[PDB]
Amino acid sequence: FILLKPVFHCLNEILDLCHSFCSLVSQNLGPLDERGAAQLSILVKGFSRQSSLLFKILSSVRNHQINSDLAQLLLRLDYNKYYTQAGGTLGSFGM
Amino acid sequence: MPREIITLQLGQCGNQIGFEFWKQLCAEHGISPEGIVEEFATEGTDRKDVFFYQADDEHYIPRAVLLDLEPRVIHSILNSPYAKLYNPENIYLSEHGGGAGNNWASGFSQGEKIHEDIFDIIDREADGSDSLEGFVLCHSIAGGTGSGLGSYLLERLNDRYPKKLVQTYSVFPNQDEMSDVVVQPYNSLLTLKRLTQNADCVVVLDNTALNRIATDRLHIQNPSFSQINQLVSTIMSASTTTLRYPGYMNNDLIGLIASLIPTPRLHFLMTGYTPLTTDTTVLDVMRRLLQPKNVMVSTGRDRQTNHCYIAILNIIQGEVDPTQVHKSLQRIRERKLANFIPWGPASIQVALSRKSPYLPSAHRVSGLMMANHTSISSLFESSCQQYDKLRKREAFLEQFRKEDIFKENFDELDRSREVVQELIDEYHAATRPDYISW
Amino acid sequence: MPREIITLQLGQCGNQIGFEFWKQLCAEHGISPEGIVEEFATEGTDRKDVFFYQADDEHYIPRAVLLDLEPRVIHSILNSPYAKLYNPENIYLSEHGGGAGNNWASGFSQGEKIHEDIFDIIDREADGSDSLEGFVLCHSIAGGTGSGLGSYLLERLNDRYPKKLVQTYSVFPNQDEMSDVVVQPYNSLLTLKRLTQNADCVVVLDNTALNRIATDRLHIQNPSFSQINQLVSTIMSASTTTLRYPGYMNNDLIGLIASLIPTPRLHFLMTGYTPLTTRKTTVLDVMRRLLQPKNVMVSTGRDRQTNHCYIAILNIIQGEVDPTQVHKSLQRIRERKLANFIPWGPASIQVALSRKSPYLPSAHRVSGLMMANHTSISSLFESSCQQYDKLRKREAFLEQFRKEDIFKENFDELDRSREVVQELIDEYHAATRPDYISW
Amino acid sequence: LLGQGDFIRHLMDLLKPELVRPATTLYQHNLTGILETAVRATNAQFDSPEILKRLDVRLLEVSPGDTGWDVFSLDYHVDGPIATVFTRECMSHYLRAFNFLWRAKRVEYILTDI
After folding, report:
1. How many CB atoms lie within 10 A of CB C383?
2. What positions belong to coiled-coil segments (chain A) (predicted)?
3. What secondary structure letter does DSSP report for C146?
């Protein structure tokens, strides 16, 4: 997917959000303070939005471009239709 | 840094399984019983440092500690052709051959009595590890050493190595035969309690299911312990195949565990192995592994409780076409051949690996399935019912009252019954759509 | 999804006919008696998965369960060259070799006694089917096991698999010979009751008519069971031809039945086959021969009082057929008004063109099967009812029934079966009438 | 043209749980998975693999008021000189034929189940 620039950009944003989450957890090995909780809620909302966008993009791409590998990625993501039931969003659970 | 794993072989069964595991590893890596590299294994692609130690003389020494409170088994290992594989200085064996008497409390008290010798050995081996990842205990929860001494070691390891992983290969006793040890359910419950509080991962190996498999699938009339241990060693080899053949992904135990155990309390993993047959597309392989008659763990298929697979990883070893893997995944999904947990996404992984070049494989392709499946709750329920059945008769408690853990009361038994109830209830919640919110 | 059919072969006659049917299927699919695909049949276009399962050893195994209460015939099959074709685990034989003794009540009680063994076999075969469409029971209505045990099994199968189709190959007893079983009409009536309540379609196989056909048309002096069973196997093959050769239309048994049985209670189908013989047959010649009464394979009394009519006719024509000639032939057959149809519905006359199996040598470029729903079967049911009433009025052979629990206290189940069969006859007559729509 | 009736019958059997859904919930990957399963589960697997590789599912233009029964279409791609034989007008004719015969088969299935 390196050549799919919009996907690559979305992926880089997702990777940076994942890195930030891992950093937050590593920085706060204990209970999070209110600041860490606010950061977690912001990250949750951003990631849910972006994962939903990714899933929507992948479905649109499947409808316009028959890319085997994007379809395989979506199938592996939603083998249990967990994503389909969550509308494609990784981690759409309220902050 | 290497991620060394120390194998602790506990009691008769644990030590025999560890010995056969190391023998199988030697055969797969081309290491002689004396620790000498076989001529055919000089060009191997395997990373031995993860599970074996390399001596300065290119000798491969198992990172295995064999612990028994009775000399017979330790002497049998030191009298085997593979006696030279293990470092003798890393083996502590209690000279007091009286054992724990199949009593978890007695095994625990013995672990306390031999604490210094054991933790001194463990620390010496840990310091001899560049990046020791953790300990894998091969023991039975029902025996004396593996149960009692295993619980003691679980406590002491939890205190001494709070940053190291604790994996167990816990052999469950046959449920269908009357145990000569009427308190075996008590020992097992105490061990399960210690696994629940102080262990990171318990791999359940049900001897009842292994016997059933030997009879029904291997056509073994009265399967011997040797044949069961040969199947176990095959399973352990399949579990170590990603260690033994260097790949591109999932080269560490951390990723495996995180993929297999999403719920820290829900750390009981079911196993599946293929082929399991007495002497092919990816999709056909996976379908055969998916056949219930080939699962090597007796979990009740409760039709009332919609048990489900939490996760499945199929490690397929041999010449596999990845395009056939993709097609097989597609066909399995379309056929809904497996029910997945409703409270999380279906984790179905497929790893392609190469076989060891040193082991002759009659089968171009083998497969292991590791599955987290809610029907294990039926096993936990059965164990709880057996405990309650024994406790309700107060049978054979005069000898328990002689032991310190049961001398005053049975509160540790009642707590174990509570813990097993909580485990059953968590399995039921995981059976429910609200488990993610449970 | 496939629509698998499990074949249940019941008693001596049912098991022997099933064996010859499976032999014919094997020959059509090029499967050796050991289950190996013949080299000339490796590239076959036939769908074996409908009726056979394929084992891991590339063996094609019939989805067939052979149940007999007597060892002689099962042992003969297992001692035949085709012993390896059938799954040995699908053969149940009662160790109590006493049978039902040609007693319907005994067969029913035996079905109840062996329910678990039978349902264990049925469940094993069902689990071995990905999308089982239904069961086809091949049995005789006149024996003990096939009648009594057949009715019991029909009930228990209807309860256990209420979503699966139940087709029967029901062998009707010879009407022209004195049955050695004076209570045979009673056993037959009880089986007819169970067919009426628990079967979706009854193909009547009259052994008397089959013998008559073998003698008059096959020139068999004293026709043997082997020759009758060869004719039966030909009929069963013709009934399975749409299963064995994938076509564009009517590719399932459900669709065939729905095309043949517009009235759920009026589900008794008559069969006809042509040629029955030991020149390019045209569609028009085929249809003309099929319409000849001399080519009907059921001995129905020609009652002059009841204007029997065809409810529906399907002609499956296998072989080299020009479709434009098929269409013209259908037009000509209609023009000649060669058949009288029910007045309360449209005349169902279907013609399916199919290709023959490439693996079976056919001397004839074209063969045909006719399946017909024709009211003259009522004459057979009336004859059976009259024979039953003649026995019941004489209390004939009731001493042994009173010994059996189903008949120990009374014969009310017999009287109810006679009532149901009377209602069936009367419904057949009403269906002969323009008021059937209001019947 | 649905010349092999078994493939079409099995495809409709598998699709009925799908094609009953509202068209807004159809996603290509599920339907391609179902097509793959049907192909491997049928006798079409003994057709040359080159034939199999060009048998695709075509989704039609999505408009509200429809369900999967009305929105499912199969497609067979063509390329090279082979595509010179079957032109866009040919393919649209084949498509119209498919969309009629599929509806007829749907209705036949409906009445059979009725």
Report:
1. 15
2. none
3. I
